[PDB]
Amino acid sequence: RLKKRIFAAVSEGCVEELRELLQDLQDLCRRRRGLDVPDFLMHKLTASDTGKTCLMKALLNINPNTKEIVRILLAFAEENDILDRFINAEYTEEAYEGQTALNIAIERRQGDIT
Amino acid sequence: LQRARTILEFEKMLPEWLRSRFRMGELCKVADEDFRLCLRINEVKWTEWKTHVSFLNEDPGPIR
Structure with missing residues (x-):
């Protein structure tokens, strides 16, 4: 539910909307059992089907911002x-x-950007 | 032009269920609730350089 909101916010150019979603990711990172939180955060920013990250989703869709x-x-x-x-x-x-x-x-x- | 007249007369005589089998094109979701039965043609251009906006698909392969 959060993963699809970030892919929509990055493709469209939602600058302000992006920031609280990453903050909501930081809200879920303070609270865990805390075993594999570097591997956990890559799981929320990478589509498991192909491997497309949200940085790759940003550059395919060029915005003015x-x-x-x-x-x-x-x-x-x-x-x-x-x-x-x-x-x-x-x-x-x-x-x-x-x-x-x-x-x-x-x-x-x-x-x-390169 | 003379061969094109031959093609359209062979098409008028074959029956109706053959015309459905030999049909050209493919349904494409062009826009929001718009399907148009389009035809596909590939190109290569070496002069016009520009960044690509307004594609339909992000993944540029022949999917399936």
Whole structure:
């Protein structure tokens, strides 16, 4: 229920709406048994079917305010220290195996995000 | 033009259930509640460079 709200908020360009949803993720991260919370937070930001992360969902849908959405998402993974796993995820299907985030930013001709 | 007149006369004589079997096109969800039975053509362009907005599908493969 929360995972689908983030994919809609990032594709459309909902800047203010994005922030409380990540805060609601921080609300669910203070409370847990607390065993595998770095692996848990990757489970909420990655579609389990293919491996598409919400950073990959941002760059496929270019908005006039897509520069700031990437700046928010890189700040969030820094604070919880899954930054290398989050910026280097891949697709897992046969048709797209190995495609990364900056492999999308080059094809969308985004010089400054890259 | 002379071969095109031959094709449309062979089509008028074959029966109705054959016309459903040899039908071109495919239903596509174009917009909100809009299905139009469209035809697909591929291209390659090396001059016009632009970032791509207003696609229908995000995943650019031949799905299934």
